[PDB]
UniProtKB/Swiss-Prot annotation:
PROSITE patterns: GLYCOSYL_HYDROL_F22_1, GLYCOSYL_HYDROL_F22_2. The lineage of its organism: Eukaryota, Metazoa, Chordata, Craniata, Vertebrata. Lysozymes have primarily a bacteriolytic function; those in tissues and body fluids are associated with the monocyte-macrophage system and enhance the activity of immunoagents. Has bacteriolytic activity against M.luteus. Keywords: Allergen, Antimicrobial, Bacteriolytic enzyme, Disulfide bond, Glycosidase, Hydrolase, Secreted, Signal. Pfam families: Lys (PF00062). This is Lysozyme C.
Length: 129
């Protein structure tokens, strides 16, 4: 599925991401835009043999198990295939674990390069929440 901007904002709000661990909702919408272009099926392969899955590009070395990544830790205790669903619930629940791990949203390269430091509340402007 490809989400619209406000559609995703609303879905993320219903799953408790607004101000979660100190990050307002606009951070999460911005991260999803530049990580996956709002596409739940985005995947990206890495030089360490890991793959990033889904709308928040969750990595298979640390967080989900894809059965092909050496050194997998599976800290979200979830198969990576579940993160390619059109329903964002599994991705959100894993994202909540990632941000609680101890470096916040810095786990998302596209967020720290392209969202951090800008007025991210513009990403939820004009949405009914």
């Amino acid at each position: 599925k490809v989400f619209g901007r406000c559609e995703l904002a609303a879905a993320m709000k219903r799953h408790g991401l607004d101000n979660y661990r100190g990050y307002s909702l606009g951070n999460w919408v911005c991260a999803a835009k530049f990580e996956s272009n709002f596409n739940t099926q985005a995947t990206n392969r890495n030089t360490d043999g890991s793959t990033d899955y889904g709308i928040l590009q969750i990595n298979s070395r640390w967080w989900c198990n894809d059965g092909r990544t050496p050194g997998s830790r599976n800290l979200c205790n979830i198969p990576c295939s579940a993160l390619l669903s059109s329903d964002i619930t599994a991705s959100v629940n894993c994202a909540k674990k990632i941000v609680s791990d101890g470096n916040g949203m810095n786990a998302w390269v596209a967020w720290r390069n392209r969202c951090k430091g800008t007025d991210v509340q513009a990403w939820i402007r004009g949405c009914r929440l």
